[PDB]
Structures are given as C-alpha cells and as structure tokens.
Amino acid sequence: DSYLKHQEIVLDTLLPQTVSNQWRINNDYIRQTCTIVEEMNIQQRKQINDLEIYRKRL
Amino acid sequence: GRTSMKIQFKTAMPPTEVLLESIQSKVESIEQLQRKLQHVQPLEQQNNE
From CA B25, how far away is CA B7, in angstroms rounded? Predict the structure, then answer.
C-alpha cells in the first residue's frame, strides 16, 4: 500500500511539470498576439486616412 | 475428503473472514488508489498532447 502511494505522487508531479510548460508556451504567444494586433491596428488607421485623403484631394 | 473439506474449509473460512475484515479495508485502500493512477494517466496524455 505504501509503494502505491510513491507510485501515485510521481504521476501528479508530471501533471504539474506539463501544466507549467503548457501555460508557459501560451504565455509567450499572448505577448506576440498583442504586439502584432497593435501593429495591424496602426496599419488600418493609416489605411483609412489615405482612403479619405485621396478623395479630399481629388 | 469430507473430513478435510470440513476441517480445512472451516479453517479457510475463518482465515478468510479474519483476513477479509482486515484486508477488505486495505483492498479498498489499495484499489481506490489504483483508480487514481487511471485518472492521473489519462490527464497526463491530454496535457502532453
């Protein structure tokens, strides 16, 4: 019965190690998403500016 | 054999029920722990995946 408790705890340690590295990968992705999403926002604003600018010139 | 069957199986039933009383509790202890491996494994794979 004691052996089975040593066997069990080992599995749940790996559950945490996987849990941490899985959340750690997603954590890095998050920053990337927010980096570019801003850059795309910057692009679209500039896009709309030209769109009306070119009209108001003509 | 009927003497043996009587003598032996009465001893067996006493040894069994004495063990069972002590060991059915420890079986449940050991068997409910086994079920924890089967869930500790199934989560392990989904996290690895």
Answer: 27
